[PDB]
């Protein structure tokens, strides 16, 4: 039953609006001083563990997204929210890279206000003109 303590502590971090020391949490959350409370914060992505003493905070973006796509060169998909968590407020940068048509973004087939961002491996009249009807002998005549 260690799943609940993290949420009551984190929503408290939202209510207090400031980071809380592990001892201040353990005293306010009335728990025995322990590594697990910190370890849940080290585990949880919605809380930031600070290397200086205890501190627990709630929880360049375009360049970070480009580097992530380059590392992703082997990976053909990524999560939209995870990229935003890695680079806070990266949804806008992801959409901008989309509009640039390089790291291009894919508009949500679920809720049309959302947009996914994807990693780059790097009109029907126009399209039908570029497609039309689609054999080997005309290809050989073409070759």
């Amino acid at each position: 039953h260690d799943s609940s303590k993290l949420l009551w502590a984190t929503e408290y971090i939202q209510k207090k609006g400031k980071p809380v020391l592990v001892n201040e949490l353990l005293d306010y959350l009335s728990m025995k001083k322990d590594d697990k409370v910190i370890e849940l914060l080290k585990k949880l992505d919605r809380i930031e563990f600070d290397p200086k003493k205890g501190t627990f905070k709630y929880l360049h973006s375009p360049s970070e997204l480009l580097k992530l796509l380059r590392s992703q060169v082997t990976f053909k998909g990524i999560s939209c929210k995870d990229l935003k968590d890695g680079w806070p407020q990266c949804d806008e940068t992801i959409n901008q890279l989309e509009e640039d048509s390089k790291i291009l973004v894919l508009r949500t087939k679920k809720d049309k206000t959302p947009r996914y961002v994807w990693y780059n491996s790097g009109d029907e009249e126009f399209v039908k003109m570029w497609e039309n009807v689609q054999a080997e002998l005309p290809r050989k005549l073409q070759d």
């Binding site: 039953h1 609940s4 303590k5 009551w8 502590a9 959350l29 009335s30 728990m31 025995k32």
Partner: protein
């Protein structure tokens, strides 16, 4: 907090058993349980929630 002590006391229980204890609508009981407990719909215990510190959780509930 009381419901969680029941969960260590019972690996399987029901929204009915919980509503009987908490005297709250099963709908509210079903929301929080989704966080702590998970549902098993198959077997003899089907339609009953199973779990996955308790005192720390109780103090966190007291704080919030």
């Amino acid at each position: 907090d009381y419901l969680f002590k029941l969960f260590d006391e019972y690996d399987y229980w029901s929204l009915k058993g919980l509503k009987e204890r908490t005297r709250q609508p099963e709908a509210h009981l079903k929301e929080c349980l989704d966080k702590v407990a998970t549902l098993v719909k198959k077997g003899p215990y089907a339609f009953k929630y199973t779990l996955r510190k308790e005192e720390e959780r109780k103090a966190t509930l007291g704080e919030l």
